[PDB]
């Protein structure tokens, strides 16, 4: 690894600098280097890892969607044959996105998840595993597509099971997991009723628990609750 010679603390410091500079590819490479030191991650470090890769893959997904839309319009009837270039370039972006997903899933499997014993770490990593299989599913078309979808479902489900037993309904990790699993149901599993039911039940159970929270915790929980409501409004 190109980060193997840098101190763990220096990698974390530089990931924070990269975030301030909006250099998310650098941020992700620094956090990959920190994970590969082999020590468990703190809550803040997990946040840095997730934010870095979410921004990298988010840009790739946005580009993939632009190119896929152009590719589909070029394949309708009446469109002029533009040659292989749109498909080739969509494939190039797709392969780069798959590579990033494989990298994150590799960090989770070697060995973040197996060493995560507390609910807050284990749920966070299993949510990430579901997210990155979900991103693979968005672009999947081959023999393993159903297994990719089910790998996302399985990871999200294990995270949900732990979160329901070990975390309050307002815990932002539990809320963010439910938000994303609900989107998985809607966009990946073709299960809009499950997506809506999960978002509504999550929202209502969190609402009933807000009275236990400090002002700071209330702000974090209500932020994600608003995203749940935003999706419910989009879907109903």
């Amino acid at each position: 690894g190109a980060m193997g010679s840098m101190e763990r603390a220096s990698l974390i410091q530089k990931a924070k600098l990269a975030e301030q500079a909006e250099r998310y590819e650098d941020m992700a490479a620094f956090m990959k280097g920190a994970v590969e030191k082999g020590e468990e991650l703190s809550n803040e470090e997990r946040c840095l890892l997730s934010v870095a890769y979410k921004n990298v893959v988010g840009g790739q997904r946005a580009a993939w969607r632009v190119l896929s839309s152009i590719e589909q319009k070029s394949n309708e009837e009446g469109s002029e044959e533009k040659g292989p270039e749109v498909r080739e370039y969509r494939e190039k972006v797709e392969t780069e996105l798959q590579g990033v997903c494989d990298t994150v899933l590799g960090l989770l499997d070697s060995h973040l998840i197996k060493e995560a014993g507390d609910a807050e770490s284990r749920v966070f990593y299993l949510k990430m595993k579901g997210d990155y299989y979900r991103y693979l599913a968005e672009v999947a078309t081959g023999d393993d597509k159903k297994r990719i979808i089910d790998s996302a479902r399985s990871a999200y489900q294990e995270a949900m099971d732990i979160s329901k037993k070990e975390m309050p309904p307002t815990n932002p990790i539990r809320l963010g997991l439910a938000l994303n699993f609900s989107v998985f149901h809607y966009e990946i599993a073709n299960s809009p009723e499950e997506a809506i039911s999960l978002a509504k039940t999550t929202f209502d159970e969190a609402m009933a628990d807000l009275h236990t929270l400090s002002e700071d915790s209330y702000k974090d929980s209500t932020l994600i609750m608003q995203l749940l409501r935003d999706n419910l409004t989009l879907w109903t």
Binding site: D131, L179, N180, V183, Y186, L227, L228, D230, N231, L234
Partner: peptide, 5 residues
Amino acid sequence: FPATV
């Protein structure tokens, strides 16, 4: 994009 975090 629906919202995800």
